[PDB]
Design a protein around this ligand. Structure first.
Ligand code: HEM
Ligand SMILES: CCOC(=O)NC(=O)c1ccsc1NC(=O)c1nc2cnccc2s1
Length: 464
């Protein structure tokens, strides 16, 4: 090797990296091999305490659940006055709003129409829309995004929309824009480790504008609801919230305000749309990649549900294989590898450490969902991670895709309904045909700053 002469070396070419959440999570696991299950990362003078492995996560989020139930401060969210909902609130405000929302989402105050009724209706509309693709190759991203968005619409203001309604398209457009901004990959430039969009000029303003747009649209619905508010006839989240505001009068200052109603409603759209959509889209990809799994799901659907009626949640206890498949989708894909960041609510002694009030806590959900003792070969998609040796469904304490403790996803039950009812309804009515031969079908996730996101794929929905 004797290359021609030339100038003194220039900067490095083609080695600037877009860091996704799955790469962050891999580094966290690597660091746990050096420092153990509880360690601190410093970003300048800001410490972040990482919890890695089931025993650390359980001891903190569950055994000390109150102390680890804080959210912390996010500056851009504070500019949008977002701390007045569920996701970003803390202390007394969070406790009452999350409790109120939980019970509303378990059919208290929501009228006769159950949450399951609303999901079932959306499931039938979802199947109709898949029919309209006429078995031609289809990128399912849009249709699978509409259905969970429509479920939240029906819960919050008792309205679902045709997938071509402009009002509905406008709302999803802003939600998709915000999700794209907020979940962009990371990058290190000089002594800075930052989201990429922090460099992109219009991003922070577009996020604030879209959030203002969404709150303003919800406010328009709230005013309509105020015209007929009826303590004896609430029928959606807005009605329930307004009834609570009525009962909390004279007890000022209430946590329940129009400002709190708008941020809670925005929270539910942002937390409940793209998580479910992305899990569904990933589910269909895994079902294309694993045709023998799909055949057994469809066999189980035929013998428990048949083809004459819609799936319902009572069917799931009789469909252990399908239940294992849905669980395994969520465990395998590891949708939110580091959940959402917590903070401790007070000074707390934790093992040999003293964690001051307000310290950021980062939870490795990957380290639990992919525990190689609880789930041997955890890198592999295998419904038998949730079946015992007799083929019965096997619940795991390591099933934490909604996190754990006091901040566990408030939509856990609703998301489980949407996953089970939508996937069984699709597979009750359609065979899935991949253009690619399954053996050559790529399932490697794409880089994303917050979530595990599946690659692009198309498929045919072939009616039965
Ligand atoms: C496959 C679907 C879903 C997954 C995997 C999921 C997962 C999660 C996770 C990991 C968190 C963070 C928990 C923590 O901070 O430790 C969370 C929070 C949250 N989720 Fe979900 N979620 C899903 C769907 C939904 C749906 C349908 C709703 C509708 C209500 C929802 C509402 C929320 C809310 C409001 C929070 C904030 C809770 C709080 O800060 O107290 N999610 N979710
Ligand atoms: C977690 C980091 O968030 C941030 O750093 N957000 C911001 O900086 C920000 C600024 C304006 S709006 C907004 N975030 C949201 O509205 C979210 N809603 C939900 C609902 N479920 C899950 C996640 C979100 S983030």
């Amino acid at each position: 090797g004797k290359l021609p002469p030339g100038p003194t070396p220039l900067p490095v070419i083609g080695n600037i990296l877009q860091i996704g959440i799955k790469d962050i999570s891999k580094s966290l696991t690597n660091l746990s091999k050096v420092y153990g299950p509880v360690f601190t990362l410093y970003f300048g003078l800001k410490p972040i305490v990482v919890l890695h492995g089931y025993e650390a996560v359980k001891e903190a989020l569950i055994d000390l659940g109150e102390e680890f139930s804080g959210r912390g401060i996010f500056p851009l969210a504070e500019r949008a006055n977002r701390g007045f909902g569920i996701v970003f609130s803390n202390g007394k405000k969070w406790k009452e709003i999350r409790r109120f929302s939980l019970m509303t989402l378990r059919n208290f105050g929501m009228g006769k129409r159950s949450i399951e009724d609303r999901v079932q209706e959306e499931a039938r509309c979802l199947v109709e829309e898949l029919r309209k693709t006429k078995a031609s190759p289809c990128d399912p991203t849009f249709i699978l995004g509409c259905a969970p968005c429509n479920v939240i619409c029906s819960i919050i203001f008792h309205k679902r929309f045709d997938y071509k309604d402009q009002q509905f398209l406008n709302l999803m457009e802003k939600l998709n824009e915000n999700i794209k901004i907020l979940s962009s990959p990371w990058i290190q430039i000089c002594n800075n480790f930052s989201p990429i969009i922090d460099y992109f000029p219009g991003t922070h303003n577009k996020l604030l504008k879209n959030v203002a747009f969404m709150k303003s649209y919800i406010l328009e619905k709230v005013k309509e609801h105020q015209e007929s508010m009826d303590m004896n006839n609430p029928q959606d989240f807005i009605d329930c919230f307004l009834m609570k505001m009525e009962k909390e009068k004279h007890n000022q200052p209430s946590e329940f305000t129009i400002e709190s109603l708008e941020n809670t409603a925005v929270d539910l759209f942002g937390a409940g749309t793209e998580t479910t959509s992305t899990t569904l889209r990933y589910a269909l990809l895994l079902l294309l990649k694993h045709p023998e799994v799909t055949a057994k799901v469809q066999e189980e659907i035929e013998r428990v549900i048949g083809r004459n009626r819609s799936p319902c949640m009572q069917d799931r206890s009789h469909m252990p294989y399908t239940d294992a498949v849905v669980h395994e989708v969520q465990r395998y894909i590891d949708l939110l590898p580091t959940s959402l960041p917590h903070a401790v609510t007070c000074d707390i002694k934790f093992r040999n450490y003293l964690i001051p009030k307000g310290t950021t806590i980062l939870i490795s959900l990957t380290s639990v969902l992919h525990d190689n003792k609880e789930f041997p070969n955890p890198e592999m998609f295998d419904p038998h991670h949730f079946l015992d040796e007799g083929g019965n469904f096997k619940k795991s304490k390591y099933f934490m895709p909604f996190s754990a403790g006091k901040r566990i996803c408030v939509g856990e039950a609703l998301a489980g309904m949407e996953l089970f009812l939508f996937l069984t309804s699709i597979l009750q009515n359609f065979n899935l045909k991949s253009l690619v031969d399954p053996k050559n079908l790529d399932t490697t996730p794409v880089v994303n700053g917050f979530a595990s996101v599946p690659p692009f794929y198309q498929l045919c929905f072939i009616p039965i």
